[PDB]
């Protein structure tokens, strides 16, 4: 599976039949149809105690993993019940600035999309969480091209060390708080993982306010390789999934 012509999102249903399930993500967010729900509590992001370990290229993107052996970097509140632990963060981006996000807002595509992946601590581990309907919480942040994002530069500078599939580099002391927009206003809905196995275990929290990144930042992203080291080079670009049918589900807004 990949994002090419022969193994792309239009082909995932053959090995992952759930690809056409009832709560597939991403989706388009209709801001006029989205329901303002007064009972939504503020998001609670506790990341001051976060511990990054490493960054790796798994062939579909780059992941920054964190130590989730203790409640160090957690998400709670909002539409969530219980504590969710940050396990990893990654992005989705395009070959151009006109495309890249997974989630769309009134059909508008953003240059990239940041996902902070957290799991419900009631299930003990990530693996047990991916089987539960309320097992994961993913925080989505859109990226637009404009002014550089200081907090993002440590990531960009390390990409050259993990250009090809399978590479990894130690990546300690990175603070995720530098990737957060100013406002915590959000939209929430029940969805799924966006890459195979596409399990329908996520509670999506998409921030309203996007973060700006500069052209040269995003550019360093487009320089990654889908392929393994020593193989014909396939630029890692357009690693996003097309919007899926909402099918009945309702999108709530905290604003
Ligand atoms: Zn993602």
UniProtKB/Swiss-Prot annotation:
InterPro entries the UniProt entry points to: CA_dom (IPR001148), CA_dom_sf (IPR036398), Carbonic_anhydrase_a-class (IPR023561), Carbonic_anhydrase_a-class_CS (IPR018338)
Comment on bound cofactor: Zinc. Can also use cobalt(II) with lower efficiency, but not copper(II), nickel(II) and manganese(II).
Gene Ontology process terms (BP): angiotensin-activated signaling pathway; carbon dioxide transport; morphogenesis of an epithelium; neuron cellular homeostasis; positive regulation of cellular pH reduction; positive regulation of dipeptide transmembrane transport; positive regulation of synaptic transmission, GABAergic; regulation of chloride transport
Binding-site positions, Zn(2+): 90, 92, 115
Resulting phenotype, residue 193 to A: Reduced CO(2) hydrase activity
Residues annotated as site: Involved in the binding of some activators, including histamine and L-histidine: 88
EC top class named in words: lyase
Residues bearing the modification Phosphoserine: 161, 168
Sequence ranges assigned to domain Alpha-carbonic anhydrase in this UniProt record: 1-255
Keywords: Acetylation, Cell membrane, Cytoplasm, Disease variant, Lyase, Membrane, Metal-binding, Osteopetrosis, Phosphoprotein, Zinc
Xref: PROSITE patterns: ALPHA_CA_1, ALPHA_CA_2
Localization, UniProt: Cytoplasm; Cell membrane
Residues bound to substrate: 194-195
Annotated GO CC locations: apical part of cell; cytoplasm; cytosol; extracellular exosome; myelin sheath; plasma membrane
Effect on the protein upon substituting residue 3 to H: Reduced proton transfer rate
Effect in UniProt of substituting residue 197 to A: Normal CO(2) hydrase activity, but impaired stability
Effect of residue 63 to H: Enhanced proton transfer
Outcome when changing residue 58 to L: Reduced activity
Cofactor(s) of this protein: Zn(2+); Co(2+)
Effect of residue 193 to F: Normal activity
Recorded consequence of changing residue 138 to F/Y: Strongly impaired activity
Quaternary state and interactors: Interacts with SLC4A4. Interaction with SLC4A7 regulates SLC4A7 transporter activity. Interacts with SLC26A6 isoform 4 (via C-terminus cytoplasmic domain).
Additional remark text: Target of drugs used in treatments against glaucoma disorder and breast cancer.
Family, per entry: Belongs to the alpha-carbonic anhydrase family.
Protein's UniProt name: Carbonic anhydrase 2
Organism expressing this protein natively: Homo sapiens
């Amino acid at each position: 599976w990949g994002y090419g012509k022969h193994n792309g999102p239009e082909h995932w249903h053959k090995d992952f039949p759930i690809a056409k399930g009832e709560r597939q993500s991403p989706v388009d967010i209709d801001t006029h149809t989205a329901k303002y729900d007064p009972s939504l509590k503020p998001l609670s992001v506790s990341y001051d105690q976060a511990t990054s370990l490493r960054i790796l290229n798994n062939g579909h993107a780059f992941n920054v993993e964190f130590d989730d052996s203790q409640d160090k970097a957690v998400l709670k509140g909002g539409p969530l019940d219980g504590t969710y632990r940050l396990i990893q963060f990654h992005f989705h981006w395009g070959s151009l600035d006109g495309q890249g996000s997974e989630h769309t807002v009134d059909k508008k595509k953003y240059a990239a999309e940041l996902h902070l992946v957290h799991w419900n601590t009631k299930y003990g581990d990530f693996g047990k969480a991916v089987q539960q309907p309320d097992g994961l919480a993913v925080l989505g942040i859109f990226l637009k091209v404009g002014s550089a994002k200081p907090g993002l530069q440590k990531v960009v500078d390390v990409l050259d060390s993990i250009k090809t599939k399978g590479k990894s580099a130690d990546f300690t002391n990175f603070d995720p708080r530098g990737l957060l927009p100013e406002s915590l206003d959000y939209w929430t809905y029940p969805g799924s993982l966006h890459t195979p196995p596409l399990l329908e275990c996520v509670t999506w929290i998409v921030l309203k306010e996007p973060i700006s990144v500069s052209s040269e930042q995003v550019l360093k992203f487009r320089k990654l390789n889908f392929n393994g080291e020593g193989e014909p080079e396939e630029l890692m670009v357009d690693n996003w999934r097309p919007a899926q049918p909402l099918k009945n589900r309702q999108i709530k807004a905290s604003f």
